[PDB]
């Protein structure tokens, strides 16, 4: 998808 | 307190591109703003200078601030390895918004993103703490080096950074 994460990047 | 202003001097594969400045909303989120400010000046002996934007998605955002691992797994705050979500008073209203990347609730480190669109779905999950003042066109220029999966075709870098006011 459209996330802004730090480590486990998801859809 | 007057909201502080910081700048990034951006480079593309070493070549200067331009300057982006940000207003930091210390009047809403003083702790979150202070962390970004200090990391931008390097006054704690570490920070954003020389770091890269590891993940850029055109039409979405530019992500950077990982100055220890340069890939999304690193960075630290001036308060320690992580700090809490200060508040969610401010929202992701449009291009230029400056907001904290995280790995779920209360895991703010040093990673951030500059929005190139309104990102409403992120409201309440990511702490908004600033907005681009000058050089949005430079952000737009940075954006063209990203891709749908985030990978950048050129090394986008913070050649220099500091506080203007």
Author numbering:
A (entry chain B): 1 to 11
B (entry chain A): 1 to 165
Please, what does the article write about this entry?
Cyclosporin A (CsA) is a cyclic undecapeptide fungal metabolite that is used for the prevention of acute rejection in solid-organ transplantation and in the treatment of psoriasis. CsA binds to CypA and this heterodimeric complex binds to and inhibits calcineurin, inducing immunosuppression. Here, we report the X-ray crystal structures of the CsA analogues E-­ISA247 (voclosporin) and Z-ISA247 bound to CypA. In both complexes, the structure of CypA, the backbone con­formation of the ISA247 isomers and the nonsubstituted ISA247 side chains 2–11 are essentially the same as in the structure of the CypA–CsA complex.
The structures of CypA complexed with E-ISA247 and Z-­ISA247 were determined at 2.2 and 2.3 Å resolution, respectively, with excellent quality of the electron density. We conclude that the chemical modifications of the ISA247 isomers at residue 1 do not induce major re­arrangements of the CypA side chains in the drug–CypA complex and that functional differences between the two ISA247 isomers result from the structural difference at the modified MePmt1 residue only. While E-MePmt1 and MeBmt1 demonstrate high van der Waals complementarity with CypA, Z-MePmt leaves a gap between the protein and Z-ISA247. This is reflected in the distances of the CypA Ala103 carbonyl groups to the MeBmt1 (4.0 Å), E-MePmt1 (3.5 Å) and Z-MePmt (5.0 Å) CZ atoms in the respective structures. E-ISA247 exemplifies an exception to this rule: it shows affinity for CypA comparable with that of CsA but superior immunosuppressive activity. To analyze the structural basis for this observation, we superimposed the CypA Cα atoms of the binary CypA–ISA247 complexes with the CypA Cα atoms of the ternary Cn–CypA–CsA complex and analysed the ISA247–Cn interfaces of the resulting Cn–CypA–ISA247 structure models. In the E-ISA247 ternary-complex superposition model the distance between the side chains of E-MePmt1 and the Cn residue Asn122 is only 2.4 Å. This demonstrates that at least one of these two amino acids has to adopt a significantly different conformation in order to avoid repulsion. Asn122 is part of the so-called ‘latch region’ of the Cn regulatory subunit. Another possible explanation would be that the CypA–E-ISA247 complex binds to Cn with higher affinity as a result of the predicted structural changes at the Cn–E-ISA247 interface around residue E-­MePmt1.
